[PDB]
Amino acid sequence: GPLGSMVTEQEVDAIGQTLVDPKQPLQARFRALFTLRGLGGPGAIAWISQAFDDDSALLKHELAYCLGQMQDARAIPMLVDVLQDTRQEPMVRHEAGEALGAIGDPEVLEILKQYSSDPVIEVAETCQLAVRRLEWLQQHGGEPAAGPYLSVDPAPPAEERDVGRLREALLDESRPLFERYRAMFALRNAGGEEAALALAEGLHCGSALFRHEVGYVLGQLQHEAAVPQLAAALARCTENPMVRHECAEALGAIARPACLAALQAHADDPERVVRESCEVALDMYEHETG
Ligand SMILES: [O-][O-]
Ligand SMILES: [Fe+3]
Ligand SMILES: [Fe+3]
C-alpha cells in the first residue's frame, strides 16, 4: 500500500540520527551507515553527508565510500566538497575521489582530471584511476558485466585468466596503476589459494594506495591463506596507517580465531584509524556470536 514510503522515510531519519550522534558507539554508527547505504534516497544521502562533521577519519572515509557505492548523482556536490577540502585526511579525500569515479557520471571528469595533480599522492593517484574508469565506461557503454562481487570497483577486471600472468602484471612497477588494478580485480575474481598469495605479494610493493587496495580485495576474497600476510602488515608500525587499517578490516571480514587475535593485539594502537578498525571488527564478531 501507500504507507510504505512513509515508514521507510521514518526509519531513514531514525537511523540517520544514530549515525550523526557522536555519543553512539562507533559500531552502531557503522551499522546505521551501511543500512542507509542500502536504503538509499535523498534523506539517506543527507544524513550521510551531515556526518562529514565528525572527528573520526575512519568513519568519514566510510561515508564517502558508501556514497560512491550508492551510485546516486545527488551525492556529487558533497563528494566534491570533501575532495576539495584540504583539511580532510588523505584517506578521506582519496575516498571521496574514488566515490566520484564510482558514481560513473562524466559531469565530474574535469574535477577528477584537475585533482590528478593534487599534492597528496593518494589523492592524485585515486583521481588518475577514476579518470581512467570514466574513460573505460565511456568506451564500453556502461559498467562491466556483473562479476562475483557486488562492489563497484575502481577498475574493471583484466581479461587475462591465467593467475601467473595476472600476478606478473600486478607486481610490475613499470605498468600504469590502472592496468595493475585491473589485474588485482581479476586475481580476486579468479579466487583460490594461488591468487590469494599472489595478491598478498602486493603488500610489499607499489604506493600506499595500491597496498591498501590489495588489503581491501584480500578482505573481499576472504581466503584464509592471506591471513598471515594481512596480520604481518597490520603488525608493521612503519606501514602507512591507511594500509594497516585496510588490513585490519580484511582480518575483520575473515573473522577466523587467528584474525581475531591479531585485531585484539592492535586494539590499543597509537593510530586512531587502526584502533577504530580493530574495535569495529571485534564488535561485529561479538554481535554475530550474539
Ligand atoms: O581508505 O582506507
Ligand atoms: Fe580507501
Ligand atoms: Fe579504507
Among candidates 57, 53, 52, 92, which has minimal Cα distance to 275? 57
* Cα torsion angle, 286, 36, 210, 240, sign: negative
Cα 94 from chain centroid? 10
Cα 126 from chain centroid? 12
Grid cell locating 265: 593485539
Answer whether 246 contacts ligand 1 (Cβ < 6 A).
Answer: yes
Give me the DSSP letters along 191-213. Answer: -HHHHHHHHHHGGGSS-HHHHHH
The burial class, CB within 10 Å (0-12 / 13-18 / 19+), for 234 is buried
Does the annotation list 61 as a binding residue?
Answer: yes
Residue 96 near residue 126 (C-beta atoms within 8 A): no
In the chain, what are the domain boundaries?
Answer: 1-154, 155-290
Answer whether 243 contacts ligand 1 (Cβ < 6 A).
Answer: no
Answer whether 95 contacts ligand 1 (Cβ < 6 A).
Answer: yes
Tell me the three state secondary structure of residue 127: helix
Technique that determined the structure: X-ray
Ligand 1: nearest atom to the Cα of 212: 2
Ligand 1: nearest atom to the Cα of 243: 2
Answer whether 61 contacts ligand 1 (Cβ < 6 A).
Answer: yes
Answer whether 213 contacts ligand 1 (Cβ < 6 A).
Answer: no
Distance 95 CA to ligand 1 centre (A): 7
Does the annotation list 213 as a binding residue?
Answer: no
Does the annotation list 9 as a binding residue?
Answer: no
Task: Quote the CA–CA distance of 168 and 159 in Å, as a whole number.
Answer: 14
